[PDB]
Design a protein around this nucleic acid. Sequence first.
DNA 1: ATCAATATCCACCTGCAGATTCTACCAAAAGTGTATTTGGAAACTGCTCCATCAAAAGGCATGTTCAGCGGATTCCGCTGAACATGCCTTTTGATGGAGCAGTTTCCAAATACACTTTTGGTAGAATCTGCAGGTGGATATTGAT
DNA 2: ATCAATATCCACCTGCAGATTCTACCAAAAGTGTATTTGGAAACTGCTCCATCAAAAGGCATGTTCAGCGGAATCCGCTGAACATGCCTTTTGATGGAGCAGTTTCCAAATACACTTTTGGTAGAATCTGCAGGTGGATATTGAT
Lengths: 96, 93, 98, 98, 79, 83, 106, 106
Amino acid sequence: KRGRKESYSIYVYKVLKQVHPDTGISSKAMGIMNSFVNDIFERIASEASRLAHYNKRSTITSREVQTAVRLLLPGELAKHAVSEGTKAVTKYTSSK
Amino acid sequence: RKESYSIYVYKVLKQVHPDTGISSKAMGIMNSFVNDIFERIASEASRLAHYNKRSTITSREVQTAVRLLLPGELAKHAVSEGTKAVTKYTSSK
Amino acid sequence: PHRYRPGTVALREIRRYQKSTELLIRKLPFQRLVREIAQDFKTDLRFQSSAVMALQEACEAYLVGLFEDTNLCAIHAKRVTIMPKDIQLARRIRGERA
Amino acid sequence: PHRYRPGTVALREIRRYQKSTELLIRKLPFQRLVREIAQDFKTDLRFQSSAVMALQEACEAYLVGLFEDTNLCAIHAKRVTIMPKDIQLARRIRGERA
Amino acid sequence: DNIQGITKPAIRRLARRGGVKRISGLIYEETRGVLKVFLENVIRDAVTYTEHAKRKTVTAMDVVYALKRQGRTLYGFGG
Amino acid sequence: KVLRDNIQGITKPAIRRLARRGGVKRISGLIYEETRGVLKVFLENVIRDAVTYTEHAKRKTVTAMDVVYALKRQGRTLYGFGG
Amino acid sequence: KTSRSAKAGVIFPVGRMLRYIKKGHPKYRIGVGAPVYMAAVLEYLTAEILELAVNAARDNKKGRVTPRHILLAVANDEELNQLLKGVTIASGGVLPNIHPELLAKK
Amino acid sequence: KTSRSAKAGVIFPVGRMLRYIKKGHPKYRIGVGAPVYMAAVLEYLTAEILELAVNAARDNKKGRVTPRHILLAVANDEELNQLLKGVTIASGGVLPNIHPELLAKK
DNA sequence: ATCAATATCCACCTGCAGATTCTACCAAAAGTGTATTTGGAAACTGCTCCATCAAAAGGCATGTTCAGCGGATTCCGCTGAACATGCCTTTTGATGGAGCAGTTTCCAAATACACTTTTGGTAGAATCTGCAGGTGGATATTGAT
DNA sequence: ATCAATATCCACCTGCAGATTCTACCAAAAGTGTATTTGGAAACTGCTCCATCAAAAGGCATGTTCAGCGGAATCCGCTGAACATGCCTTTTGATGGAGCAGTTTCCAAATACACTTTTGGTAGAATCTGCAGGTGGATATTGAT
């Protein structure tokens, strides 16, 4: 009946422990990791839709997400992020 | 065919001074301007109509936008103008 | 009586503050400064306890970044003393200028 | 043999070039530059005339501004001759220093 | 006079973190003016949001947004 | 043809003109090279984004919008070229 | 028929703009006033800069406004100048301005 | 049941992301490729920073990651620093630095 | 170099503010059949981009000479740093009291959806004039004598 | 002060490129009629923001003493500005051809509702612990003799 504030907390925490089981994340620290994910999330979807627009497309797809990414991230960071992304969509598909 | 604001920019141009014309190049610029700001405003408009969980862009959103987007004096005379025109429209029928 | 030569303490102060992350402006005074200013825009206004922290965070950060640039300007003019003009040149180039 | 003192012609030039608006870089030498670079990114590209001109508009504007700030920096150091470290300070404060 | 509540000692501490060593005495007022303009700009846009939202309380998100459009993004207050 | 070292097309005379409109009265000798350095970076970046938009539209031609769109990403809006 | 523009007393295309708002932010509904308000603010602004560019053209002793005029108009007006940060006026030029330290003799 | 995120091979909320991609950019049909890519990219980025932040935490003899660590982590990596121009990490402090022009003497 | 006044660093201890783990309701993701949409495919069109060509002058390049700028250096007046001092006020912790957000539930008011009628833009074409570019000379700025 | 060398500012002229009117096709606004839907309004719960009061500590304002820094002043080395010389390469303009951007018609594969069943995620509580904060014995740093 009352507020159910959603966040990326649990996920950041999993990613953290997944490779640093003996390393905690402070509250404020988690709050920053949140602003980051939200920040970037926004830039990407924002550019992505922007991309669709220029190409008079009515659908936001992985294609636009990847382009959005190349336009948004620096050199090597984008390189790997793209690999990670294309690798994800792959597995999601090579199954169901 | 392609649309632009030229005819309008030109109409307005003729009201400030009847004996002055404009190069197509300068007209090309008045166009970039209108289109530019037209976007800024509408984009804050939704980014605003959104933040408040609304599903409609109204003169009210457009106005708050304008307030945020323009420098002191321009902002005022702009708000009047709009406030005015919307009032007029809301009586044309 | 022991007495440190000029600049030794300051140099010591820099190392100290660049190590810490705590606010360096008095909280209560800052709050009065915010509400006062905010007032001149809208009367009878409340502030989420956190919205004031955010303001201070932003304010302090802005100034520390500005001094970084200003210091770059003093040093450029072959000085170690940051003077008003250094702050001007800096804001100027940043596109802030007034 | 008549001859202006060093600096008289420069101020002539400044007034001259600040009053006009034509591009200051040769068009063809610039187009080669644009294609050379693009080629080194994606082969077999084509450029609208306007695109190249858009690029040159953007480039010349950019450097004329970097030069204005570079000039504030020189003058700030009590100099009238711009130097690399001037361009570098300006760029740094602008956030470009990447 | 609320402003001056921004003491010289505080400003100096800021500048220290800023890596500054010497400080012209004129800096302080100069810093007070600059800071005044900053807070003004942000708080003005913050409120605008607070009001367009038909609220009486300036929330953290209003400030975060004000900040955003000033080009200054802030992490740590979106929760 | 083979394009090589065309940044040298940005000649000393040229850069001086740019500096004159920029209000500069005297120029160190190491400026011309410094400047081409700065220029090749900015240009490479604008073109890089532009070409990206172009590749996305699946075109083989860099259009003006592309450049314009690219310049806005760098936060620089250009007037007088919009569609 | 009577164009909405006329109804609201503006020159700029009110309907054409309701359409541009939609093609851009499909999702939202557009109050019948927004496109109106928009067209009124935009015509206002364009009027402001034309007023200054025209004068600028006339001082220059020119019967037709050019980009250099629009620049000088925007360059010399504090608020239009502010409204146009990071805007490059193609073929525009720069405000003439020499720093004092550059002027010779004594 | 099976979660797309599970099938995707990611920790981040592919489902939730999709919902967000929609609530935010409302007039667009959204292919299932999108939310998955996003999840994966934002997860990497998260992982990326956390890695360096931790190094900074340990570097600091501390076992818990704080903002001071994230900033130190960010400000020291050239690419993360670039990606975050404008970002102000609340309570992250600045990066230790003293021009040598200020240094004592020796 | 040798004190010696001070600051800073490191080893060790521990209560607790704050991070972590945990016990369940429930909004939301996943599952399913059907209805609505989209953008890649493919043949086709004409717009504009690339490559040529020959002429030639505007403009780049190179070398010489020297003016004046930049910087090194000496010097001193005095603004900021360091420090002891007297003490105002920000800081800390509690504290109901009600302003005031976020929730919900109902419904008149106001876009949206799908058509059909009417005409304000637009592209191309016929028509016109501001001004680019050369011409000459009077005026002002420059620089040497 | 005076004058010879040059560059600047200007009033006139005029053909023509480019700006300004002129005409009729056609997306596209402007009417109509329901179909769907917000979002203000009345109603109400409760997370927090504010107002007051009352300490001790941690600052802050201050004022005295002077180190050394900024800024002025002098000087000369050599690096950039001015300039004339030699001529290349950019510009300018007309020409051809096709690569390819833009449009059009259409079949199917992907997304979008409308909607029901299945848990992952959140909130508040229960259990847990990293690091602040204090002590101190030793080393390092700064500064004077």
